[PDB]
Amino acid sequence: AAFKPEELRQALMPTLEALYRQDPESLPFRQPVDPQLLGIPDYFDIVKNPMDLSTIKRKLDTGQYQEPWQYVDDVWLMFNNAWLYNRKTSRVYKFCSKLAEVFEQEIDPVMQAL
Ligand SMILES: CC(=O)N1CCc2c(c(Nc3ccc(-c4cnn(C)c4)cc3F)nn2[C@H]2CCOC2)C1
């Protein structure tokens, strides 16, 4: 199957918006991590492939996904980066876990539809 850019946007953008709607849980994920602003200079030494909601949105808007699984992979990269970097007791880690639950719920019916 070949997927057209607007087909992917129409199907997948609502799943990304579902994450944005989580407040406060999406707040640490709405923009790229800025280690200087956040006072965490070790961030890029630990996280080699940063990813965040705004980058995923831009990739959908600019047709950079050819297959739905590539979008899923970027969302999961964002989650895995946060679980790797942040401590289990931290706000960002627990917020990540909530987003992962929401994403799992929203993405499945969409994948069944395509
Ligand atoms: C995604 C990721 O790995 N990050 C690396 C670590 C990090 C990140 C944010 N950002 C952030 C955190 C919390 C809130 C927030 C808003 N409302 N509430 C109740 C909480 C908003 C944010 F933008 N802080 N920290 C660290 C630095 C000091 O604090 C924890 C991003």
Side-chain angles (χ1 to χ4, degrees):
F3 296 92
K4 297 171 175 307
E6 184 65 4
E7 175 185 10
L8 293 173
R9 199 179 70 98
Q10 286 293 322
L12 302 173
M13 189 68 76
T15 72
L16 200 69
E17 293 295 354
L19 303 187
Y20 273 99
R21 285 198 296 274
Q22 309 308 304
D23 190 352
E25 292 89 349
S26 73
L27 296 178
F29 302 94
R30 289 181 176 184
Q31 55 290 308
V33 174
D34 181 338
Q36 172 171 248
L37 172 70
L38 295 174
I40 52 175
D42 66 356
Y43 183 80
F44 292 143
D45 294 328
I46 292 155
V47 173
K48 296 312 181 178
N49 295 296
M51 187 54 57
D52 74 291
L53 295 171
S54 74
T55 298
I56 299 167
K57 184 181 182 299
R58 175 72 164 171
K59 289 178 70 172
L60 276 171
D61 283 333
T62 61
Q64 291 185 53
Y65 301 118
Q66 283 61 241
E67 312 276 351
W69 64 262
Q70 294 171 311
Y71 164 80
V72 176
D73 281 1
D74 269 348
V75 174
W76 267 86
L77 176 59
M78 178 182 73
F79 297 156
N80 279 321
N81 289 342
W83 284 322
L84 171 69
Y85 181 77
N86 299 278
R87 303 281 209 206
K88 182 176 177 178
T89 51
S90 70
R91 294 167 298 157
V92 172
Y93 188 109
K94 295 176 183 296
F95 289 179
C96 181
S97 295
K98 174 62 176 186
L99 296 187
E101 183 179 75
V102 172
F103 187 67
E104 162 182 298
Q105 294 170 355
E106 297 300 317
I107 194 62
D108 182 44
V110 173
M111 293 300 316
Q112 301 307 318
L114 266 94

